[PDB]
Write a protein that binds this ligand. Structure first.
Ligand SMILES: NC(=O)c1ccc[n+]([C@@H]2O[C@H](COP(=O)([O-])OP(=O)(O)OC[C@H]3O[C@@H](n4cnc5c(N)ncnc54)[C@H](O)[C@@H]3O)[C@@H](O)[C@H]2O)c1
Length: 319
């Protein structure tokens, strides 16, 4: 398996399958796609409490284990603690809920989805009558301490974070009494937001950057501005793709791979799922990597504007 070593010694497959379910996409479609992904050969599956599909991911995994397609030990399952569950007393029960949905005894990786907490409750996106998000005040170091307890309980193999900036990572890392460092920071990262400064920081601290939106996202309009540029139609990308005899998607993934990043790739289409697994079969030259570095625009498809009115909103800082 093409894997990257985490700072706790665990191995993460270097390409993961994404499972965000758009608002209009039925759960049955998420289930089918996850089943197919396992047949196609994906081993790393990335999901989240807030995606509403852990049950479907759990069904896909157990049905494919029962059929002999895969064994649990062959899979790397990530899920994410949602903002409404950051209060320390809610963390382990939220993980236990997710494990039940997933039909798993443990997950391979459990991460804080953002550094910003939200009002606790069943609603994942609590708002007032004006539609303003109801946020909360909870030190992410206090949430982190409970993730450490989850790991010590054997409910999760590795723990990490998502959508943290370098100051926020520093706060965890420099906290007196810290037990375990985050193994990863999962962030938006792609040719238009190449994260070079955050990447260099993470490398210096032995933290792996896991890239979502690696292909420019599925462009689900609940979260992604419809006027955003279409990464896979970029002219420089398409020229590099033609020169290398690979698809634009494969170039965009390989770019990240060669920088030590673990990209996620989502598709519902079988041949796209199949093609993305080809990313370990070719290499990009230093000249083409230089060309691809030139595409950075500091452009975020997923700015999480619903979290903006909070001092831990992560994306104001330079990196
Ligand atoms: N941690 C976070 O805050 C966070 C937030 C959002 C999503 N995610 C995760 O990131 C995953 C990836 O993000 P995403 O789902 O938005 O999409 P993505 O960037 O992987 O984009 C998927 C799009 O790429 C296209 N595509 C895929 N393979 C292709 C191929 N070989 N050729 C041509 N086109 C191809 C498809 O059209 C698809 O709609 C999610 O599914 C989810 O698991 C994480």
């Amino acid at each position: 398996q093409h894997c990257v070593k985490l700072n706790d010694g665990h191995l993460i497959p270097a390409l993961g399958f994404g499972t965000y379910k758009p608002k209009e996409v039925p759960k049955s479609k998420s289930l089918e796609a996850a089943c197919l992904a396992l047949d196609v050969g994906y081993r790393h599956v990335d999901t989240a409490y807030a995606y509403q599909v852990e049950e479907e991911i759990g069904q896909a995994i157990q049905s494919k284990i029962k059929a002999g397609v895969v064994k649990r030990e062959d899979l790397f399952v990530t899920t994410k603690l949602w903002c409404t569950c950051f209060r320390p007393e809610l963390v382990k029960p939220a993980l236990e809920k997710s494990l039940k949905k997933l039909q798993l005894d443990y997950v391979d990786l459990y991460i804080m989805h953002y550094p910003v907490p939200m009002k606790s409750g069943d609603n994942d996106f609590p708002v007032n009558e004006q539609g303003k998000s109801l946020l909360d005040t909870v030190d992410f170091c206090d949430t982190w301490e409970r993730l450490e307890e989850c790991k010590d309980a054997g409910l999760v193999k590795s723990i990490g974070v998502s959508n943290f900036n370098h100051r926020q990572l520093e706060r965890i890392l420099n906290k007196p009494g810290l037990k375990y460092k985050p193994v990863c920071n999962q962030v938006e990262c792609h040719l238009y937001l190449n994260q070079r400064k955050l990447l260099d920081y993470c490398e210096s601290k032995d933290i792996v950057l896991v890239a979502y939106g690696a292909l420019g996202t599925q462009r689900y309009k609940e979260w992604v501005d419809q006027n955003s540029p279409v990464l896979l139609n970029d002219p420089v990308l398409c020229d590099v793709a033609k020169k290398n005899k690979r698809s634009p998607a494969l170039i965009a993934l390989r770019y990240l791979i060669q920088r030590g990043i673990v990209p996620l790739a989502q598709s519902f289409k079988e041949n796209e799922m199949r093609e993305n697994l080809q990313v370990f079969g070719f290499q990009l030259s230093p000249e083409d990597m230089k060309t691809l570095d030139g595409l950075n625009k500091n452009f975020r498809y997923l700015p999480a504007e619903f979290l903006v009115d909070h001092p831990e909103y992560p994306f104001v800082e330079e990196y």
